[PDB]
Amino acid sequence: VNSFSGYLKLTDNVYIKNADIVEEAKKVKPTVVVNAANVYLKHGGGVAGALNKATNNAMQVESDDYIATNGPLKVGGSCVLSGHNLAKHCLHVVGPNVNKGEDIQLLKSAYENFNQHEVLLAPLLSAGIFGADPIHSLRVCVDTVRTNVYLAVFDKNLYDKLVSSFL
Numbered sequence: 698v699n700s701f702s703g704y705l706k707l708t709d710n711v712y713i714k715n716a717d718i719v720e721e722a723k724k725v726k727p728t729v730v731v732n733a734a735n736v737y738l739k740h741g742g743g744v745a746g747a748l749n750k751a752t753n754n755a756m757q758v759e760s761d762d763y764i765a766t767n768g769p770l771k772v773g774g775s776c777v778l779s780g781h782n783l784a785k786h787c788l789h790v791v792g793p794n795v796n797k798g799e800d801i802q803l804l805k806s807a808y809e810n811f812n813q814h815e816v817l818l819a820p821l822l823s824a825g826i827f828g829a830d831p832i833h834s835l836r837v838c839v840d841t842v843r844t845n846v847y848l849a850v851f852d853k854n855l856y857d858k859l860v861s862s863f864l
């Protein structure tokens with residue numbers, strides 16, 4: 698039993714809700730919140746910009762030190778950093794950005810990072826400003842993640858389409 702509330706159950710392990718991931722994280726304080734990161738950990742917009750803003754830019758400061766030490770992530774890769782005031786940990790995961798021409802097959806690799814954590818609050822990878830089809834992202838999530846994932850979908854219209862079209 699966990700403290701996630703109001704989710705629809707899609708499968709044994711995947712749950713979905715129309716919610717602002719920032720507000721969800723602030724309420725639940727999960728062990729792991731997933732960020733829709735880029736390889737440079739430049740949290741300018743989308744989910745990443747919103748999460749970073751909620752940390753008063755502390756996420757960006759920590760991220761800049763991480764990159765200065767380690768260099769960029771791989772597309773499809775991840776790193777674990779602090780969750781600041783939002784969660785214990787933030788799993789920064791790089792889905793392919795279709796608006797940069799990146800290979801959508803890497804979306805499965807990106808979701809594989811979730812399997813290293815028993816429970817996660819997450820957005821749909823490569824959705825929003827990353828340019829991928831969210832219906833496809835949900836399908837890859839369900840077919841790749843085996844741990845317990847609670848998906849927050851900000852847009853109510855998109856949430857309803859994802860549920861109604863889910864196979």
Ligand SMILES: CC(C)(C)[C@@H]1CCN(c2ncnc3[nH]ccc23)[C@H](CO)C1
Pocket residue numbers: 716717718719733743744747820821822823824825826849850851852855
């Ligand atoms: C569908 C659309 C492109 C409009 C969104 C954009 C951002 N994003 C978010 N998801 C959950 N919580 C969020 N909080 C702030 C942003 C955000 C989604 C990533 O799957 C896609």
